[PDB]
C-alpha cells in the first residue's frame, strides 16, 4: 500500500508534514481529522445505532447550567447513544463518567455541553449535530501528536473514508508543494 504519504514530523503547531514519492505534504491536522471523525462517527451511527463509548478516570466538573440538568433528567438513553454518559453531582452541576472514543484527550465538557444543550426542545430529528458541533474536538487543537507512530494513523484518514478533497468549506487540507520546490530557492 503506497499511501497518501508517510508522516515525518510536525509543523509549528497546526500542520503535519509527510514524505511520499512526490514530496512532503502539509496535512491540516485539525481539518482532516474533523473530516475523518465526522465520517467515522456517522458510519458508526448508521450501524449499531450508537457511538462507541469509553469511561475514564477523573471526571470533569461540568458546572451544568440549570435546564441542562433537566435535559439529563429527560431520557439519557440518547446521550448513551452519543457515547456520552454523565451523572449529576448535586445542585446544578454534572460530571461525565464516559466520553465517546475517537475524540477523548480533553475538553469533554464542550462535547457534553453541546449534546446536552441540544437535548432541549425535543422533536433529535436533525442528527446533524454529530458534525463539527459534536466534532468540536477534531484532533489535537495545537498540542502534540505523539512521536510519529500515530501520525501515520491520521495519514491513513481518507483511505476507505469518502469526502476527502473538498472540506467543510472547500479549503484544502493537504498537499500544495511538489518535488519542484527548488524554485523557492531563487
Amino acid at each position: 500500500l503506497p499511501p497518501l504519504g508517510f508522516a515525518i514530523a510536525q509543523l509549528l503547531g497546526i500542520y503535519i508534514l509527510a514524505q511520499a514519492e512526490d514530496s512532503l505534504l502539509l496535512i491540516d491536522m485539525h481539518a482532516a481529522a474533523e473530516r475523518v471523525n465526522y465520517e467515522k462517527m456517522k458510519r458508526q451511527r448508521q450501524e449499531n445505532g450508537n457511538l462507541q463509548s469509553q469511561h475514564l478516570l477523573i471526571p470533569v466538573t461540568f458546572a451544568a447550567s440549570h435546564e441542562e440538568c433537566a435535559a439529563l433528567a429527560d431520557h439519557a438513553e440518547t446521550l448513551a447513544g452519543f457515547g456520552l454518559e454523565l451523572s449529576d453531582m448535586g445542585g446544578n452541576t454534572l460530571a461525565v463518567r464516559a466520553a465517546p472514543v475517537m475524540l477523548g484527550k480533553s475538553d469533554v465538557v464542550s462535547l457534553a455541553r453541546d449534546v446536552l444543550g441540544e437535548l432541549a426542545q425535543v422533536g433529535a430529528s436533525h442528527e446533524n449535530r454529530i458534525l463539527a458541533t459534536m466534532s468540536c474536538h477534531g484532533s489535537i487543537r495545537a498540542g502534540r501528536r505523539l512521536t510519529l507512530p500515530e501520525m501515520n494513523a491520521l495519514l491513513r484518514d481518507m483511505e476507505n473514508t469518502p469526502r476527502s478533497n473538498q472540506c467543510n468549506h472547500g479549503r484544502p487540507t493537504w498537499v500544495k508543494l511538489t518535488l519542484k520546490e527548488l524554485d523557492t530557492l531563487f
Binding site: 475514564l56 478516570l57 477523573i58 498540542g143
Partner: protein, 366 residues
C-alpha cells in the same frame, strides 16, 4: 591564587549540578557553574532559570571571589585527575588556571555579574521535615504515573500536598494514578504544590543520606528542599491538580492477594509475545486461578497461570502491560492486593495491610 583543595572535595559538590545544568542552553553562561569564595568558605551554584541548586564546597580558599566556568569541562577535568591529588585554582584576567601535579588547564571564565539567580520568595507558608529514605520511597512509589508532556501542564508533574499531619504524593497521566502518603511530625494548613518532572528527578538524585532528614519549605510559587548541605529551589507548575479522592474506587469487591515477584515475572514473560502497537494483556480472574494472556499479529500466544487465594466471580479484563509492570517494579513489597470491579471500571493495586499506598489503572477493551 584563589583556591587550593583536594580533588574529591571539589568533584563531589559539583556532581549536584549536572542534571540542572543544560549542556546547550540559549544563554551561554547557563552552561557554567558559579564558584563563590567568601569568608574562607566556598559555595557552588547552578541553575537553569527554573531549578537553582547550591551547595558548600571546599574550605582552603584565600580571599573572596566570584566566577563562572564551564561545568562540563571543569567536572571532566576534576574527574580525570587522580583521586587524592591537590588542585590549585588561580585567577588571571578572564582565565582560571587549574594546576594538579604537572597538569595545567587554562579555562576561560565568565563574570559572576551575568550569572542569573532565582528571585526566591520570602513567603514561607509551610515547613516540615521527614526521613530521606521515607521521602525517596514515596517518590519512587509515585513517580512512574506522571504524564510526560501532556496537553495539561499540571499533569506533567507530581502533586505534593500537606494537610494536618499527613503528607501525600499524587501522580497521574489520565489513564492511571499513583497515591502515596505518610505521617509527618507537624500540624500544617492544607497546602499543595505541583513539582515539575525535572525537580522530581533532581530531588530523587539528591536523597542519598537515608538516615538523615530533609526539610521541605513551601513558598510563593516555589519549593525549597534542604538536606546534606545542599539547597534546591524550584518553581511549581501552576494550576490545579485533579481531586484524587474521586479517582480512588471504593466498590471493587473482587479482591485477592498474590506474590508481586510472581506476577511481575509472569508479565515480563508474556509481554514478549504481545502486540507491539497496543501492548495489551488480558487477565482472566476465576476462583483459584489468574491467567495472563498476550497475543500478537503473527498468531503467537503467551500464557502464564498463577494460583491465587480467590473466591469470587470471574472477570476478563484488559490492561496496558506497561502500567502493570511499572507498579510491580517500583514497589518492593513481597505481595500485592488486587481489587477488581467489573470489566469497564477501575482496578485498585495496594500493599496488604498498608493503607498508605494506592494505585488505580483503568482497563482497556482488548
Amino acid at each position: 591564587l584563589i583556591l587550593q583543595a583536594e580533588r574529591d572535595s571539589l568533584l563531589k559538590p559539583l556532581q549536584a549540578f549536572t542534571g540542572i545544568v543544560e549542556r546547550l542552553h540559549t544563554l551561554p553562561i547557563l552552561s557554567n557553574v558559579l564558584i563563590e569564595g567568601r569568608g574562607g568558605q566556598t559555595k557552588l551554584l547552578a541553575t537553569d532559570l527554573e531549578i537553582q541548586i547550591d551547595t558548600a564546597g571546599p574550605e582552603g580558599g584565600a580571599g573572596d571571589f566570584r566566577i563562572t566556568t564551564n561545568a562540563k569541562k571543569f567536572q571532566d577535568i576534576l574527574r580525570a585527575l587522580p583521586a587524592g591529588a591537590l588542585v590549585s585554582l588561580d585567577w588571571d584576567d578572564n582565565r582560571l588556571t587549574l594546576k594538579a601535579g604537572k597538569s595545567r588547564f587554562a579555562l576561560q571564565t565568565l563574570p559572576a555579574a551575568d550569572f542569573p539567580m532565582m528571585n526566591v520568595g520570602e513567603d514561607i507558608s509551610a515547613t516540615f521535615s521527614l526521613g530521606q529514605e521515607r521521602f525517596k520511597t514515596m517518590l519512587s512509589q509515585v513517580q512512574y504515573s506522571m504524564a510526560v508532556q501532556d496537553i495539561r501542564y499540571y499533569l506533567n508533574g507530581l502533586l505534593m500536598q500537606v494537610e494536618g499531619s499527613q503528607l501525600r504524593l499524587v501522580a497521574t497521566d489520565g489513564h492511571r494514578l499513583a497515591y502515596a502518603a505518610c505521617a509527618i511530625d507537624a500540624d500544617l494548613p492544607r497546602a499543595e504544590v505541583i513539582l515539575p518532572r525535572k525537580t522530581v528527578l533532581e530531588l530523587f538524585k539528591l536523597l542519598n543520606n537515608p538516615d538523615d532528614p530533609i526539610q521541605i519549605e513551601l513558598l510563593d510559587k516555589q519549593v525549597r528542599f534542604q538536606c546534606n548541605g545542599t539547597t534546591i529551589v524550584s518553581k511549581v507548575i501552576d494550576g490545579k491538580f485533579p481531586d484524587f479522592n474521586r479517582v480512588i474506587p471504593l466498590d471493587n469487591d473482587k479482591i485477592f492477594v498474590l506474590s508481586r515477584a510472581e506476577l511481575l515475572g509472569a508479565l515480563e514473560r508474556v509481554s514478549i509475545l504481545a502486540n507491539e502497537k497496543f501492548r495489551g494483556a488480558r487477565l482472566f480472574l476465576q476462583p483459584g486461578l489468574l491467567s495472563v494472556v498476550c497475543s500478537n499479529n503473527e498468531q503467537e500466544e503467551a500464557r502464564e497461570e498463577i494460583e491465587i487465594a480467590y473466591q469470587g466471580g470471574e472477570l476478563e479484563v484488559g490492561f496496558n502491560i506497561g502500567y502493570l509492570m511499572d507498579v510491580l517494579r517500583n514497589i518492593h513489597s513481597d505481595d500485592m492486593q488486587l481489587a477488581f470491579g467489573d470489566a469497564n471500571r477501575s482496578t485498585l493495586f495496594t500493599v496488604p495491610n498498608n493503607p498508605n499506598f494506592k494505585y488505580i489503572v483503568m482497563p482497556m477493551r482488548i
